[PDB]
């Protein structure tokens, strides 16, 4: 069977179509027909070609101290990032930041030189 297109159905002894992101398996394939895929209901999603019986619930609204970098769409879960003044202290596997921390502010006579791998400010002295 073809990757991200179909899967092997041991009971029907044939490959059956996978459902595209934004859809889920409404009816498995059988001797007569191939998979029947339904549209994800509102506030739900599927991000990969799947055999899912239902779509996944989108995580709730981000909030004031977060920016909604990725909206909740039939193919995308909602993704929340820290604002530009902060960096993430604990990331979720999908990139969603659970915990934001403010970036270090450079003191008087200092300025931004760049950021470290964690996203925090690196300060240099101004000449």
């Amino acid at each position: 069977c073809e990757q991200g297109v179909s899967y092997y159905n041991s009971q029907e002894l044939k490959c059956c179509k996978l459902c595209k992101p934004g859809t889920y398996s409404d009816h498995r394939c059988d001797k007569y027909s191939d998979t029947i895929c339904g549209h994800c209901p509102s506030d739900t999603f599927t991000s990969i070609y799947n055999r899912s019986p239902w779509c996944h619930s989108c995580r709730g609204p981000c909030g004031t101290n977060r920016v909604e970098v990725t909206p909740c769409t039939p193919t995308t879960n909602r993704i929340c990032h820290c604002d530009s003044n902060s960096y993430c202290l604990l990331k979720a596997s999908d990139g969603n930041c659970v915990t934001c921390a403010p970036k270090t502010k450079c003191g008087r006579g200092y300025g931004k030189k760049g950021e470290d791998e964690m996203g925090n400010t690196i300060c240099k002295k101004c000449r």
Side-chain angles (χ1 to χ4, degrees), residues 48-63:
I48 64 176
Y49 280 73
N50 66 86
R51 275 222 277 165
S52 319
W54 306 112
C55 298
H56 316 290
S57 325
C58 276
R59 70 177 81 236
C62 295

Side-chain angles (χ1 to χ4, degrees), residues 61-69 79-84 86-90 96-101:
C62 295
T64 309
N65 54 341
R66 254 54 149 186
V67 179
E68 191 193 275
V69 306
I79 300 293
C80 304
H81 278 193
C82 300
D83 59 31
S84 60
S86 316
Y87 66 82
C88 191
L89 260 164
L90 172 57
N96 192 74
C97 186
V98 177
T99 310
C100 299

Side-chain angles (χ1 to χ4, degrees), residues 20-30 33-95:
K20 72 185 172 280
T23 74
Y24 68 96
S25 175
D26 186 13
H27 298 273
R28 291 166 198 259
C29 66
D30 52 26
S33 77
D34 206 344
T35 314
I36 290 164
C37 310
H39 283 171
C40 279
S42 182
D43 298 305
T44 67
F45 78 92
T46 61
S47 67
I48 64 176
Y49 280 73
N50 66 86
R51 275 222 277 165
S52 319
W54 306 112
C55 298
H56 316 290
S57 325
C58 276
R59 70 177 81 236
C62 295
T64 309
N65 54 341
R66 254 54 149 186
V67 179
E68 191 193 275
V69 306
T70 313
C72 165
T73 85
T75 69
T76 57
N77 191 355
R78 178 180 272 111
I79 300 293
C80 304
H81 278 193
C82 300
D83 59 31
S84 60
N85 277 301
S86 316
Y87 66 82
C88 191
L89 260 164
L90 172 57
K91 283 198 185 185
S93 70
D94 64 342

Side-chain angles (χ1 to χ4, degrees), residues 11 15-18 21-22 26 37-38 48 55 72-73 91-92 103 108 126:
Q11 298 176 12
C15 299
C16 291
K17 279 166 189 196
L18 278 182
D26 186 13
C37 310
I48 64 176
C55 298
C72 165
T73 85
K91 283 198 185 185
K103 282 178 189 167
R108 298 278 185 181
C126 296

